[PDB]
């Protein structure tokens, strides 16, 4: 069985960051943009290498997810957001994806109030099987110039993993949920 | 001689985390209202901690957490910068003045330079000369916060407290510190 190493972005040399980026881009090839890479930087990376070649990657970066309960109170949850999860093609189906998520979920459970991610279609059963909840209500992003704006192309994609919500808060996945602002894909 | 260890929030046991919080709360003491509040501790969670311990006792702490800083340049183009935000920098009172806080900020600035486009913090009044000497820039224009119900809302209590450390600004961006700057939303003190 393989085990992922967990490394902060700042503990990654440029050679190893460039190798990770190139492995991720190839893994997403039919798609992975310059903004997509920026989104994967700043947090903890899960890495698996074999003889100096990276064969699996994932990242969890901190952001705020905003949720307003029925009673009208607002919540700005410390969110561990999962990005750039990828296994080299020739090494897929061997549990390397599971090893990446095991290490990232340890980060989420140890440090954040909620995990969240916008899953590709292929990865959906994988996350469902691990206990991630599909979000059923509308999604949105908090923009700097127009307030909260709907993001309908992301409604089907969003999964959350509530690990340490504030005392008495219970997420209703049919309500709206809002992510903080960034360039490119908000979710 | 003094070197802090870097550890992510998720690698601290609850007892070390709780000790860190108690130590930082006391460091911020000069009645029953703690100057360093529960929300203040939450803002230190989720990133990299710099720790210094001496025969088991935690004698220094600092953290850098990821946020977005929003800045609109003089050309009208908006930027959502990946920001390493510095929180809860503290040295046990009896050990101050020996380079421990310098050692904490050394480690945190390494995180910022290696991971983020910009470092930022909201400095206590008395700590401002220290940050200037380390090459942080004082922000001179108005500060604000992007709220989910109101618009961008001015935060005048934090004007003149903000410092930034621009380590990897995109392509041609050059910060003009007289313009407005805006932080993302969180509970408690936004800056
Ligand atoms: C997504 C990706 C990382 C999965 O990697 P992988 O090596 O195929 O995955 P694994 O072999 O580790 O399988 C992961 C888990 O999903 C499970 N699984 C896969 N398909 C499943 C299905 N239809 N139903 C139930 N479980 C399923 C496996 O059983 C495994 O769980 P297990 O370890 O308990 O058995 C890989 O396909 C990839 O890199 N794709 C390209 C990039 C991409 O699209 N990334 C997803 C963005 S979130
Ligand atoms: C502010 C603090 C972290 C500085 O740590 P320190 O270990 O005492 O300071 P250092 O010895 O590393 O010196 C760093 C700089 O701090 C300044 N400073 C602040 N308090 C100082 C003190 N008691 N003794 C010496 N320098 C002090 C000096 O300008 C010094 O610069 P220098 O070495 O070039 O002379 C620490 O005194 C403390 O915990 N105070 C409580 C308040 C606080 O931390 N504010 C939050 C940061 S915004
Ligand atoms: C730290 C600095 C002063 C050089 O280091 P240094 O002068 O050798 O300082 P040290 O590391 O030896 O500090 C230890 C000494 O601090 C003194 N000291 C400072 N605070 C003390 C305290 N609270 N208790 C006891 N001694 C203290 C003591 O004399 C101690 O020596 P001793 O106990 O052995 O007698 C350095 O940061 C510097 O030169 N600062 C430049 C200023 C700057 O950055 N400004 C730029 C303007 S933009
Ligand atoms: N875009 C068209 C389709 O893209 C697919 O790839 C999938 C994937 O990239 C993408 O997945 C989702 C989208 O769902 C969702 N609307 C936004 C979200 N940020 C994105 O996210 C995913 O891909 C990004 C790269 N982008 C990565 O940066 C990100 O970490 C990853 N989780 O959408 C696709 C499936 O939903 C295939 N290439 C092909 O089946 C088809 O062409
Ligand atoms: N009065 C002198 C000193 O005051 C300190 O209090 C200062 C401190 O709380 C606070 O400092 C600044 C403010 O400026 C600024 N407008 C907002 C910013 N979030 C805050 O931040 C600072 O204190 C917080 C705890 N709150 C920490 O969580 C935070 O990491 C720290 N950088 O404002 C106070 C005055 O600057 C301490 N009580 C003690 O170190 C000493 O007594």
Q: Which residues pair with A75 in a beta bridge?
A: A67
Q: What angle do CA B149, B154, B155 make, to 5 degrees?
A: 105
Residue with tokens 């108690």: B22
B78 and chain A: CB distance < 8 Å anywhere?
yes
CB contact under 8 A, A106 and B10: yes
Structural domain count of chain A: 1
A166 and chain B: CB distance < 8 Å anywhere?
no
Q: Tell me, what DSSP letter sits at residue B184?
A: P
Other C-beta atoms within 10 Å of A168: how many? 6
Evaluate: CB of B166 within 6 angstroms of ligand 3.
Answer: no
A41 and chain B: CB distance < 8 Å anywhere?
yes
How far apart, in whole angstroms, are the C-alpha atoms of residue B18 and residue B14?
6
Q: How was this structure determined?
A: X-ray
CA distances from A112 to A125, B74, B86 (A): 24, 36, 17
CB contact under 8 A, A42 and B115: yes
**Chain A residues touching B69 at Cβ < 8 A:** none
Binding residue ranges of B for CoA: 89-91, 96-101
| Ligand 4, atom 34, residue with closest C-alpha | A120
Q: Tell me, what DSSP letter sits at residue A175?
A: S
Chain A CA closest to residue B109: A10
Task: Identify whether the C-beta of residue A171 lies closer than 8 Å to the C-beta of residue A160.
Answer: yes
Residue with tokens 């050679």: A15
A50 and chain B: CB distance < 8 Å anywhere?
no
Token code pair at residue A104: 């990232």
How far apart, in whole angstroms, are the C-alpha atoms of residue A81 and residue A117?
6
Other C-beta atoms within 10 Å of B124: how many? 13
Residue with tokens 């609109």: B72
**Of B85, B61, B87, B74, nearest to B5 (Cα)?**
B61
Residue among B26, B97, B191 whose CB has most ligand 2 atoms within 8 A, to mutate? B97
How far apart, in whole angstroms, are the C-alpha atoms of residue B109 and residue B167?
10
Query: Which residues fall within 8 angstroms of residue A88, CB to CB, at 6 or more apart?
Result: A23, A26, A27, A53, A54, A55, A56
Please provide residue B24's backbone torsions phi and psi, each rounded to the nearest 5 degrees. Answer: -65, -45
Evaluate: CB of A143 within 6 angstroms of ligand 4.
Answer: no
Evaluate: CB of B99 within 6 angstroms of ligand 3.
Answer: yes
Q: Is A158 exposed, middle or buried (0-12, 13-18, 19+ CB in 10 A)?
A: buried
**Of A75, A79, A42, nearest to A59 (Cα)?**
A42
How far apart, in whole angstroms, are the C-alpha atoms of residue B49 and residue B80?
24
Q: Is B72 exposed, middle or buried (0-12, 13-18, 19+ CB in 10 A)?
A: middle
Task: Identify whether the C-beta of residue A169 lies closer than 8 Å to the C-beta of residue A75.
Answer: yes
Token code pair at residue B100: 């421990």
Test mutation, B6, B63, B67, B80, chain A, max A CBs within 10 A: B80
| Ligand 2, atom 33, residue with closest C-alpha | B99
The H or E element spanning position A15 is helix A14-28
Question: Please, what sign has the CA dihedral across residues A14, A15, A16, A20?
Answer: positive
Task: Identify whether the C-beta of residue A138 lies closer than 8 Å to the C-beta of residue A154.
Answer: no
Closest ligand to the CA of B106: 2
Chain B CA closest to residue A149: B148
Q: Which domain holds residue A177?
A: 1-187
A149 sits in the region (left: phi over 0; alpha: psi -120 to 50; else beta) called: beta
A22 and chain B: CB distance < 8 Å anywhere?
no
Q: Tell me, what DSSP letter sits at residue A153?
A: G
Return the HEC string of chain B: CCCCEEEEHHHCCHHHHHHHHHHHHHHCCCCCCCCCCHHHHHCCCCCEEEEEEECCEEEEEEEEEEEEEEEECCCCCEEEEEEEEEEEEEECHHHCCCCHHHHHHHHHHHHHHHHCCEEEEECCHHHHHHHHHCCCEECCCCEEEECCCCCEEECHHHCCCEEEEECCCCCCCCCCCCCCEEECCCCCCCC
Among candidates A10, A142, A145 on the partner chain, residue whose Cβ is nearest the Cβ of B114: A10
How far apart, in whole angstroms, are the C-alpha atoms of residue B143 and residue B152?
10
The contacts found for B151-159 with CB under 8 angstroms, 24 or more apart, are B151/A147, B152/A144, B152/B182, B155/B183, B155/B190, B155/B191, B158/B122, B158/B189, B158/B190, B158/B191
Evaluate: CB of B1 within 6 angstroms of ligand 3.
Answer: no
How far apart, in whole angstroms, are the C-alpha atoms of residue B181 and residue B191?
11
A5 and chain B: CB distance < 8 Å anywhere?
no
Resolution expressed in Å: 2.0
């Amino acid at each position: 069985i393989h085990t992922a190493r967990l490394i902060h972005t700042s503990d990654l040399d440029q050679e190893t960051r460039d190798g990770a980026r190139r492995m991720v881009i190839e893994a997403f090839r039919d798609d992975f943009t310059d903004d997509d890479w920026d989104h994967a930087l700043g947090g903890m990376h899960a890495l698996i290498s074999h003889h100096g070649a990276l064969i699996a990657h994932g990242a969890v970066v901190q952001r705020r997810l905003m949720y307003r309960g029925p009673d009208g109170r607002g919540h700005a949850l410390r969110c561990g957001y999962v990005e750039a999860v990828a296994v080299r093609e020739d090494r897929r189906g061997d549990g390397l994806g599971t090893a990446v998520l095991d290490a990232l979920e340890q980060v989420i459970r140890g440090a954040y109030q909620i995990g969240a991610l916008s899953a590709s279609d292929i990865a959906r059963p994988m996350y469902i099987a691990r206990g991630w909840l599909s979000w059923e209500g509308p999604t949105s992003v908090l923009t700097p110039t127009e307030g909260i704006v709907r993001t309908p192309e992301d409604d089907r994609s969003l999964f959350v993993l509530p690990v340490d919500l504030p005392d008495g808060l219970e997420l209703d996945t049919a309500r709206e949920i809002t992510c903080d602002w960034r360039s490119g894909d908000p979710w």
